[PDB]
Amino acid sequence: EAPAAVVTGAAKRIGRAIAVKLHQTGYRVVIHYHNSAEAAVSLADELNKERSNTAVVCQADLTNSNVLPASCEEIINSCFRAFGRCDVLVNNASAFYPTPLVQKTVETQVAELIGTNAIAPFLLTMSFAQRQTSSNLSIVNLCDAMVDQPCMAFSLYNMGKHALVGLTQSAALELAPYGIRVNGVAPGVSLLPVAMGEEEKDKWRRKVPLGRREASAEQIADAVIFLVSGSAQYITGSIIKVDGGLSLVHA
Amino acid sequence: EAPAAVVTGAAKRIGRAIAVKLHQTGYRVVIHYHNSAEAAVSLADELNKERSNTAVVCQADLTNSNVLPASCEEIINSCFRAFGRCDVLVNNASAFYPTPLVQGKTVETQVAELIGTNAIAPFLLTMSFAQRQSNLSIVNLCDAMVDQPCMAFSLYNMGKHALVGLTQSAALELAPYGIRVNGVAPGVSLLPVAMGEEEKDKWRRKVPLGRREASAEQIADAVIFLVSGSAQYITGSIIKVDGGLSLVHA
Amino acid sequence: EAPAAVVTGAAKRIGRAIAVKLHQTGYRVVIHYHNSAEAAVSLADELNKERSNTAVVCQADLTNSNVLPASCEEIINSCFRAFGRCDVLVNNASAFYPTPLVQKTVETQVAELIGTNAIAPFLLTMSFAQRQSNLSIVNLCDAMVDQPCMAFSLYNMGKHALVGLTQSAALELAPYGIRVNGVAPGVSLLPVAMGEEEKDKWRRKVPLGRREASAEQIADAVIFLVSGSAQYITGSIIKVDGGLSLVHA
Amino acid sequence: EAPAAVVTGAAKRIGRAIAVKLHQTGYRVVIHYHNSAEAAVSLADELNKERSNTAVVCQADLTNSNVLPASCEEIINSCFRAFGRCDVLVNNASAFYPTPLVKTVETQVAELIGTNAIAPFLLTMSFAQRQKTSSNLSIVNLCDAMVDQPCMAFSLYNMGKHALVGLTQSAALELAPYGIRVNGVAPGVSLLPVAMGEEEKDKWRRKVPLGRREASAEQIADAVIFLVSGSAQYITGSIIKVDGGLSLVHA
Ligand SMILES: NC(=O)C1=CN([C@@H]2O[C@H](COP(=O)(O)OP(=O)(O)OC[C@H]3O[C@@H](n4cnc5c(N)ncnc54)[C@H](OP(=O)(O)O)[C@@H]3O)[C@@H](O)[C@H]2O)C=CC1
Ligand SMILES: NC(=O)C1=CN([C@@H]2O[C@H](COP(=O)(O)OP(=O)(O)OC[C@H]3O[C@@H](n4cnc5c(N)ncnc54)[C@H](OP(=O)(O)O)[C@@H]3O)[C@@H](O)[C@H]2O)C=CC1
Ligand SMILES: NC(=O)C1=CN([C@@H]2O[C@H](COP(=O)(O)OP(=O)(O)OC[C@H]3O[C@@H](n4cnc5c(N)ncnc54)[C@H](OP(=O)(O)O)[C@@H]3O)[C@@H](O)[C@H]2O)C=CC1
Ligand SMILES: NC(=O)C1=CN([C@@H]2O[C@H](COP(=O)(O)OP(=O)(O)OC[C@H]3O[C@@H](n4cnc5c(N)ncnc54)[C@H](OP(=O)(O)O)[C@@H]3O)[C@@H](O)[C@H]2O)C=CC1
Ligand SMILES: Nc1cc(N)nc(N)n1
Ligand SMILES: Nc1cc(N)nc(N)n1
Ligand SMILES: Nc1cc(N)nc(N)n1
Ligand SMILES: Nc1cc(N)nc(N)n1
């Protein structure tokens, strides 16, 4: 049978491009969403028109809470229910906003920023592993090429992305005996935030050495496709920067 | 007037050595503790006998919860109540235990303890310290092995990576206030009290520089340097104090 | 119409596997070699049998010396002479042996370990850029660069210098459309001279599979980085190490 | 009996400040110099006025060449002949100028890779060969906090400074059994060229989060003094950034 993948935050932007490219590669896909039901279903409709019964949607809030472990177990379960297997987990869903150190409650911001970017990937990783040859099992975490030169006033976001690097490495070591590889893709500037102004976006584009433009979502997805492929069978614990050289540029 | 410091998890082991060395350098200290009340009170008594009214204790659970922000605000308030200022914060308190990915505490309690103590509480204490504000600095106790982690310690490792992120992000953001933010990263220092001697010696034998763990004082010496005037231009730096351990391959 | 690639130290082992996989991908290839003339000519014969006029050999010593720039210029020139273009450079050739700090001359060790692993890549990069679509350079790095083998100081210095070159050249050549990336093996093909017991010792250290990477696994990462699927990637070093660099002492 | 230190490139700027602070700490010093003989002698005379017979000069070109190993052996020998011991080596001397990818290039290699990396390596060999519980032996290499966000067109300089990181780590591992520690100090923006226009200096100063100014040579020297002290006796293989946060600043 075809392998199956879960992509979190898959209704739009980078997660959608990842789901599309996995599907084009021959995967059946679980399209996870929180608020974007109409977009999730629109994508599933598009993929199922290409190949019947090869895409399902799955709703969950990935904010940390007392119920997050059960939510994460249910996302993994949805893949096994639809497809009978779950070969690939892509932890793409992410909250992103500033949290100044000097003046939503701060503890809500913790639950969102550290929940979506680190704790939910951790719980999904546990559930994915618990449910596990010619198999090619792997997890890809969407990281951030600027983790070591962070945006001003983004402490909690940066802490969450750092925690995700730690998860990538710890899980790669711990799951290697099961043949599960765990890797990351770290975009620099890709699709800019919808809310961001045009002038601010051009400011970011101009800093990129390679072509003075942001990565398309498809360019990010290309690195994910490589890491889940048979061409990456010895690669685990690696984080591939896809940033056009941005992280190499000094202040 | 003498400067004052908050040290978290200061009743025993490395946090006590830090509080003692700060005290010996001339600081007044807040000795934070969670469960180790007798040890905390014993240390404050020793320091106060050395120079009166130079040490207080402050109790707090640093597990993450909706009241953790108020707890962290209260630890910093305790320093200002006792001493009228707060010059230095050392984020030392830490939970440390395995959380295997494949199979008493629920996973959400493990998250609240391992990520709370190692990362969120340092973050909220950093916010409270900065909000209340000369040689001001914060020192975070990091881990030199963050990129070659112990098997089955994923949540602990996530929390220490988050602490690196806080160290860098806060150094950038608080530099305009003249608050420096740095880290000290031990390799093997005081082994866990529950560990048997044979298992302790396994760890000792790994260390290139002398095949022994760091003393608590050796860790404290790096903290003392980073809060001193000899580190006035240093911010966002994490000093490994690991005897070469992190350079040793498999 | 076919693009062309230079691979250094391409007669045997990982460089051979990279030359073969590039050729299978559609590249014309310059097979650089130093001493392995028979193996180099054998490979070119094999590739030319598959598609005529798609492989040549090029001999050069990559030890540092005052004529190394000319030698590196000549390797790049050989690609233009044979194929009229040079799209890809793979810096694979490398000397590897211990240089203990406490007791060939040391100056020869420096010329060989720093020359092959760092200075020749730099001069090849210069000549590649000066002579100039999907242009790219791939440097073979070492995943163990921050947990070095005991008594391999000069080797480790050369591989750290190569990381520096990868990043510096990525920045400097980005405006010309040339991407510069690295692939960092952990343990791949073990040295021919190493005993079976030591080989097994290294294999047992690797989390993912308890075995070394095949040369083909390393080549597969090189293929990705030169491909259209990596056209926004520059300055990146991909570890291909089965988790080895994550394992504590 | 007083310990002794070799400082390379000690006639001016950072190396001068290191030599002065070591002398103030109680060390006898070898002031290595290449071209600045007048300044090296002037420093030796100042230090000897403070305490007789505590400073000597040693001239050597640290460009790589057939004779560089002999030169580096001589520098260490000079400390033993003057003072009967050599406790500390500070590899401070450094060439710094652009080498665009698009003086012969082999001269540039000899100067940039020889000063910044090969001479430190040969000095390290000579230091260790001479030592083959009051003792506190250590080497401090002057590294660069911006090594992973390099200046445009400085490839050979950056390669040399990355090689020096490798030396620091490799030598820490290998010399640990002899009780020799090996560490680094990595400045960001420190003493700028006096001839550099103040407009350009200000461009660099405004980049630095902590104080919007460059480090003094004394601030760099303070980190060296810590690393060679009794307070750093478990520290080996560590590189301390002294950069005011500059390396954390994104493009
Ligand atoms: N875009 C860029 O430039 C960069 C991206 N990255 C990383 O790449 C990945 C994708 O980035 P991008 O496409 O911009 O991401 P977005 O900011 O567009 O967020 C992706 C999705 O995450 C989901 N999400 C947000 N909060 C929650 C929550 N509480 N519960 C569940 N799902 C949630 C949302 O799904 P829904 O819409 O269904 O509510 C959202 O559509 C992320 O991990 C990001 O950090 C890293 C660096 C730069
Ligand atoms: N020891 C070592 O070898 C290493 C240490 N480090 C780091 O150095 C620092 C000191 O290490 P060490 O002395 O071994 O630390 P310990 O494990 O001894 O813990 C220090 C203190 O943390 C406090 N703590 C634990 N959980 C909580 C909580 N929920 N709320 C509040 N306080 C809490 C405890 O206070 P109480 O006793 O009052 O309950 C404890 O005494 C830590 O950050 C550690 O991660 C890093 C690498 C190795
Ligand atoms: N094998 C492994 O486990 C690992 C490999 N790597 C890196 O991967 C790359 C390939 O590794 P591997 O295949 O083992 O390499 P080898 O050790 O097999 O060397 C590759 C080739 O380099 C050439 N070479 C050596 N010295 C010189 C010189 N003075 N002038 C010119 N060429 C020279 C030789 O060519 P000839 O035979 O023609 O004389 C040799 O065949 C290297 O850069 C290596 O550092 C990194 C980590 C681990
Ligand atoms: N200044 C800064 O902002 C920064 C400095 N650093 C590092 O800190 C250290 C000190 O910096 P700084 O004081 O500015 O250094 P300088 O550029 O002033 O150079 C120091 C000395 O190196 C010596 N030197 C140069 N070339 C040779 C050679 N061929 N042979 C022997 N000695 C030579 C020269 O000695 P002489 O005058 O006797 O000929 C020179 O005075 C260096 O390693 C530097 O890379 C790192 C980052 C930034
Ligand atoms: N770094 C980013 C950017 C962005 N636009 N969205 C997320 N979730 N993370
Ligand atoms: N890394 C460690 C070791 C230890 N013994 N305790 C804590 N909190 N952290
Ligand atoms: N050149 C080489 C050969 C080899 N066998 N291993 C390494 N790291 N490099
Ligand atoms: N990084 C630098 C700056 C500078 N002025 N001199 C040297 N040798 N290195």
Q: Tell how far CA B50 is from the center of its chain.
A: 24
Q: Are A174 and B174 in contact (CB under 8 A)?
A: no
| Structure resolution, Å | 1.5
Cα distances (angstroms) measured from residue D207 to each of B165, D109, D213, D214: 20, 30, 8, 9
Residues in D closer than 8 angstroms to A146, CB to CB, are: 250
How far is the C-alpha of D212 from the C-alpha of D210, rounded, in Å? 6
Q: Which two tokens stand for residue B75?
A: 């630890």
Task: Please state, in angstroms and rounded to a whole number, the distance separating the CA atoms of residues A233 and A227.
Answer: 8
C22, burial (CB in 10 Å: exposed 0-12, middle 13-18, buried 19+): buried
Is 3.40.50.720 the CATH classification of the domain at C1-249?
yes
User: How far is D114 from B139, CA to CA, in rounded Å?
Assistant: 37
The 3-state secondary structure of D152-187, one letter per residue? CCCHHHHHHHHHHHHHHHHHHHHHHHHCEEEEEEEE
SS3 B58: strand
Euclidean distance between CA atoms D161 and A250, whole angstroms = 16
For residue A25, count CB atoms less than 10 angstroms from its CB and return exposed for 0-12, middle for 13-18, buried for 19 or more.
middle
C74, amino acid identity = E
C45 burial type by CB count under 10 A (0-12 exposed, 13-18 middle, 19+ buried): exposed
Region of B13 on the Ramachandran plot (φ > 0 left; ψ -120 to 50 alpha; else beta):
left
CA–CA dist C211, C208 (Å, integer): 8
For A67, A105, A110, B119, the CA distances from B68, given in Å and listed in that order, are: 20, 12, 11, 12
CA distance D95 to D160: 10
Euclidean distance between CA atoms C227 and C231, whole angstroms = 7
Question: Using CB atoms within 10 A of its CB, is residue A2 exposed (0-12), middle (13-18) or buried (19+)?
Answer: middle
User: What is the spatial distance between Cα D220 and Cα D143, in angstroms, rounded to a whole number?
Assistant: 11
For the CA atoms of A228, A229, A233, A239, the dihedral, rounded to the nearest 10 degrees, stands at -40
- Calculate ∠ Cα D248-D250-D251, nearest 5°: 145
**Amino acid in position D155:** S
Can you name the residues that pair with B179 across neighbouring β-strands?
B136
- Asked if residue D17 lies in contact with residue D9, where contact means CB atoms within 8 angstroms, the answer is no
Residues 6+ apart with CB under 8 A from A139: A88, A89, A90, A91, A125, A128, A171, A175, A180, A181, A182, A183
From CA D60, how far away is CA D65, in angstroms rounded? Answer: 12
Q: What radius of gyration do chain D's Cα atoms show?
A: 17
Neighbouring CB atoms inside 10 A of C16's CB total 24
Q: What is the DSSP string of C54-89?
A: -EEEEE---S-STTHHHHHHHHHHHHHHHHS---EE
Q: Find out whether B9 and B93 touch, Cβ atoms under 8 Å.
A: yes
Annotated binding residue D94: yes
b/e per residue A168-201 (b: at least 16 CB within 10 A): bbbbbbbbbeebbbbbbbbbbbbbeeeeeeeeee
Token digits of residue A117:
């970017």
CB contact under 8 A, B245 and C247: no
Burial class of residue D204 in the structure, from the number of CB atoms within 10 Å of its CB (0-12 exposed, 13-18 middle, 19+ buried): middle
Check residue D179 and give left, alpha or beta (phi > 0: left; psi -120 to 50: alpha). left
Q: Which among D124, D126, D17, D1 is positioned nearest to D70, based on CA atoms?
A: D126
Task: Provide the CATH number for the domain formed by A1-251 in this structure.
Answer: 3.40.50.720
Q: Beta strand A88-91 with A55-59: parallel, antiparallel or unpaired?
A: unpaired
Active site members of A: 144, 157
Q: Which of C33, C62, C96, C113 to mutate to test the pocket of ligand 7 (most atoms within 8 A of CB)?
A: C96
| DSSP secondary structure letter of residue B246 | G
* Nearest partner of B63 among B104, B105, B99, judged by Cα: B105
For helices A13-25 and A37-50, the axis angle rounded to 10 degrees is: 20
Which of B87, B143, B147, B201 is flagged as catalytic? B143
d(CA A122, CA C173): 39
Residue D133: DSSP 8-state: -
Q: Encoding tokens for residue C152? A: 């391999």
| Cβ-Cβ contacts under 8 Å for D177 (sequence gap 6 or more) | B208
D150·A251 Cβ contact <8 A: no
Q: Are D190 and D217 in contact (CB under 8 A)?
A: yes
Closest CA to A39 of A16, A17, A20: A16
How far apart are alpha carbons A249 and C4 in whole angstroms?
A: 30
Tell me, using a 6 A CB cutoff, whether residue C34 lines ligand 3.
yes
Which residue among B71, B94, B200 has the greatest number of ligand 2 atoms within 8 angstroms of its CB, and so is best to mutate? B94
CB atoms within 10 A of CB A147: 22
Q: Which structure tokens are listed for D187?
A: 């400045």
Distance (Å, whole) CA A213 – CA A207: 8
Structural domain spans, chain A: 1-251
Sign of CA dihedral B41, B42, B43, B44: positive
Q: What is the DSSP letter of A183?
A: E
A29: region left, alpha or beta (phi > 0 left; psi from -120 to 50 alpha): beta
Task: Tell me how far the alpha carbon of residue D140 is from its chain's centroid.
Answer: 7
Instruction: Write the CB contacts of D107 (distance below 8 Å, at least 6 apart in sequence).
Output: none
- A162, A165, D85, D122, D178 from C102: Cα distances, Å: 40, 38, 18, 11, 10
How many CA atoms, within 13 angstroms, populate the side-chain half-sphere of residue B191?
Answer: 13
CA distances, B14 to each of B20, B141, D210 (Å) = 10, 10, 29
Q: How many angstroms separate the Cα of D208 from the Cα of each of B138, D38, D243? A: 19, 34, 8
Q: Tokens representing A62?
A: 């990935």
* CA B123 – CA A159 distance, rounded (Å): 9
Instruction: Read off the tokens for A78.
Output: 């949805």
Rounded CA separation B43/D91 (Å): 43
Question: What is the crossing angle of helices B13-24 and B216-227, to 10°?
Answer: 50
CA of B59 to the centre of ligand 6 (A): 20
Q: Which amino acid is at C49?
A: K
Alpha-carbon gap: D160 to the closest alpha carbon of chain C (Å): 6
Termini Cα distance of chain B:
51
Sheet containing B238-241, strands listed edge to edge, beginning at the edge strand earlier in sequence: B55-59, B28-33, B4-7, B88-91, B136-141, B179-186, B238-241
Reduced to 3 states, what is the DSSP secondary structure of residue A118? helix
Residue D136 has which token pair?
């506190």
Query: How far apart are the C-alpha atoms of C233 and C221, rounded to whole Å?
Result: 13
Experimentally, how was this structure solved? X-ray
Angle between helices C215-226 and C13-25 (to 10 degrees): 50
According to DSSP, the β-strands at C237-240 and C178-185 are parallel
- Measuring CA to CA, how many Å separate B106 from each of A7, B109, B120? 26, 5, 19
Contact D54, D128 (CB under 8 A): no
**Which residues does ligand 4 sit against, CB inside 6 Å?**
D 9, 11-15, 33-36, 61-63, 92-96, 111, 115, 142, 144, 187, 189-191
Euclidean distance between CA atoms D220 and D223, whole angstroms: 6
**DSSP letter, residue A150:** P
Containing H/E element for A186?
strand A181-187
Give the contacts of C81 (CB within 8 A, at least 6 positions apart): none
Given a contact cutoff of 8 angstroms between Cβ atoms, the answer to whether A148 and B168 are in contact is yes
Query: Could you give the CA distance from residue C112 to residue C119 in angstroms, rounded to a whole number?
Result: 10
Cβ proximity of A69 and A42 under 8 Å: no
Ligand 8 nearest-atom number relative to CA D146: 1
Whether residue D181 contacts residue D141, with contact meaning beta carbons closer than 8 Å, is answered with no
Closest to B57 (Cα-Cα) out of B84, B26, B79: B79
**CA–CA separation, D84 and D3 (whole Å):** 9
In 3D space, the residue among D58, D61, D60, D54 whose CA is nearest the CA of residue D84 turns out to be D54
Instruction: Indicate if the alpha-carbon torsion angle B12, B14, B19, B21 is positive or negative.
Output: positive
* B193 reaches A (C-beta below 8 A): no
- Token digits of residue B4: 């004052």
List pocket residues of ligand 1, CB cut-off 6 Å: A 9, 11-15, 33-36, 61-63, 92-96, 112, 116, 142, 144, 187, 189-191
How remote is the C-alpha of B198 from its chain's centroid? 27
- Annotated binding residue B163: no
C-alpha to C-alpha distance for C169 and C164, rounded to whole angstroms = 8
3-state secondary structure of A242: strand
Cα–chain-centroid distance for residue D210? Answer: 24
Q: What angle do CA B94, B249, C205 make, to 5 degrees?
A: 105
Residue reference for tokens 């799209």: C87
CB within 8 Å: D249 and A246? no
For residue D60, the cross-strand partners are none
Question: Which residues contact residue D241 at a Cβ distance below 8 angstroms, ignoring those fewer than 6 apart?
Answer: B234, B236, B237, D145, D186, D188, D247
Measured CA to CA in angstroms, residue A165 lies from A160, B67, C118, D174 at distances of: 9, 28, 29, 30
Name the nearest CA neighbour of C172 among C216, C103, C234.
Answer: C234
Measuring CA to CA, which residue among B108, B6, B105, B31 is closest to residue B65?
A: B108
A244 known ligand binder: no
- Residue C88 forms beta bridges with which residues? C5, C136
Residue in the structure block whose two tokens are 């083909």: C216
As given in the structure block, the two tokens for residue A156 are: 């909690």
D125 vs C185: CA distance, rounded Å: 29
Rg (CA), chain C: 17
Counting atoms of ligand 4 from 1, which one is nearest the CA of D161?
Answer: 45
CA dihedral angle for residue A155, residue A161, residue A165, residue A171, rounded to 10 degrees: 120
For domain B1-250, give the CATH superfamily: NAD(P)-binding Rossmann-like Domain (3.40.50.720)
DSSP string, B191-233: PPTTS-HHHHHHHHTT-TTTSSPPPHHHHHHHHHHHHSGGGTT
Q: How far is B65 from chain D (nearest CA, A)?
A: 30
Write the CB contacts of D24 (distance below 8 Å, at least 6 apart in sequence). Answer: none
Residue C212 gets which letter from DSSP?
A: P
CA angle D80, D81, D84 (to 5 degrees): 50
Q: Do D249 and A251 touch (CB under 8 A)?
A: yes
What are residue A58's DSSP bridge partners?
A32
> Is some CB atom of chain C closer than 8 A to the CB atom of D72?
no
Cβ contact D226:B229 at 8 Å: no
